[PDB]
Amino acid sequence: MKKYTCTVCGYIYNPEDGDPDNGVNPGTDFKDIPDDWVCPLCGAGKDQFEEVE
Amino acid sequence: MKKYTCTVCGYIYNPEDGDPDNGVNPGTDFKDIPDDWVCPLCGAGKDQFEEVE
Amino acid sequence: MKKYTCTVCGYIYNPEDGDPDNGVNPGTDFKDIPDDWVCPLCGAGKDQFEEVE
Ligand SMILES: [Fe+3]
Ligand SMILES: [Fe+3]
Ligand SMILES: [Fe+3]
C-alpha cells in the first residue's frame, strides 16, 4: 500500500500504522478511510492529501 | 476498458458511463480522458487514480 | 507543481516564484513550505490554502 502526505502540514499517512486513535485501524488503505477523516496534525480533509510515490 | 478509482475519495470512473457533465463521453478509456480532468467528487488529479481490482 | 490560493485574501502561492523574502525559495512545493510560514498579505496559515485545479 501507498503512503499519502498531507499537503497542508506534511503529515504522512502510513497504511501499516493506520491512525487507530481516530478509528483508522493499522493496515487500512487510504482509499478505504472514511471521507470525513482529517489529518491528525492539522485537521485538513482527505482531499488535501496526495500519494507519496 | 477497466474501471479506475480515485484513491483520495473512492469515486469510480466507469468507462461505460464516462463523466458526460465534464465532457468525458461513455466509452472513454481512462488514459484518454483529457489530463486536466479531475475527480468530480474531490478534485484530485488523474495521478491519484488506480485501476480497480 | 500546483498553485495554491489563500481562501482569506486570494493571494496565490506559485511554486515557481516561491516567497523568497520570507524564506521560501523558487521551486518549493507547497507541501514542503515550513509549517510556520503564513500568507504574506493576511497572515493566514497553510491550513487556509486550497489547491487551484
Ligand atoms: Fe496535515
Ligand atoms: Fe476523488
Ligand atoms: Fe491570505
Swiss-Prot record, chains A, B, C:
Cofactor notes: Binds 1 Fe(3+) ion per subunit.
Cofactor(s) this protein cannot do without: Fe(3+)
GO biological process, one term: alkane catabolic process
Modified residues (N-formylmethionine): 1
Molecular function, one GO term: iron ion binding
Domain Rubredoxin-like as annotated: residue spans: 1-53
Keyword Magnesium recorded: no
InterPro entries according to UniProt: Rubredoxin, Rubredoxin-like_dom, Rubredoxin_dom, Rubredoxin_ET, Rubredoxin_Fe_BS
Alphabetical keyword list: Electron transport, Formylation, Iron, Metal-binding, Transport
Residues annotated for Fe cation binding in this entry: 6, 9, 39, 42
Methyltransferase is among the record's keywords: no
Similarity comment text for this entry: Belongs to the rubredoxin family.
UniProt-listed NCBIfam families: RubredRD
Summary of the function given for this chain in its UniProt record: Rubredoxin is a small nonheme, iron protein lacking acid-labile sulfide. Its single Fe, chelated to 4 Cys, functions as an electron acceptor and may also stabilize the conformation of the molecule.
Record-given protein name: Rubredoxin
